[PDB]
Amino acid sequence: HIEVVGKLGSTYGIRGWLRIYSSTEQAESIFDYQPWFLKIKGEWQSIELENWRYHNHEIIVKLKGVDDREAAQILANVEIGVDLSVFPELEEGDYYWHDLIGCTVVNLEGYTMGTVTEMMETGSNDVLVVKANTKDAFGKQERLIPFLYEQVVKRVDLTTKTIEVDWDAGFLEHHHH
Secondary structure (H helix, E strand, C coil): CEEEEEEEEEECCCCCCEEEEECCCCCHHHHHCCCEEEEECCEEEEECEEEEEECCCCEEEEECCCCCHHHHHCCCCCEEEEECCCCCCCCCCCHHHHHCCCCEEEECCCCEEEEEEEEEECCCCEEEEEECCCCCCCCCCEEEEECCECCCEEEEEHHHCEEEECCCCCCCCCCCC
16 A cells, blocks of 8 residues: 655745655656655655645645645655555556547648547447547548557657547548658
8 A cells, every 4th residue: 555755844935835855766756646645643644735846956845734834844854655556447448548538649641630538448449539629621520530559549659648540531631642
């Protein structure tokens, strides 16, 4: 279950913010987990993160119940932990699918197919449900693109949240040339 991933520091400002030091393998990664757990009196106390930002090469955090210098003072130097245990076994697809939701699909011709709103499994066939852009060139509202690696879905790039596919926009679409 719970594993240490950081430590709270000195209070900043007068409204509750305080510095942070994360043991997380890289750095900002401690922010991909919720809720957080502060070890107080040798016990894990759950706590919600509200926001965070940079203050001169120094990350600073703002927690839910903390709203002032004195309330943050109490938390100085306590360990932060998160629940890294396994997630429930999915009855459909895999966790990686979740990263495709919201990506933009563009075919080999550079045409923007729209934003993928859902991965749909109908039987043994998985399909990306793409919400076409407002009034796109071929009059389609939605596209069902087979989630097939190599022949249809060429690449996924979360760096710019994009999915490249070899899928015609419409019958009359012009090709490479």
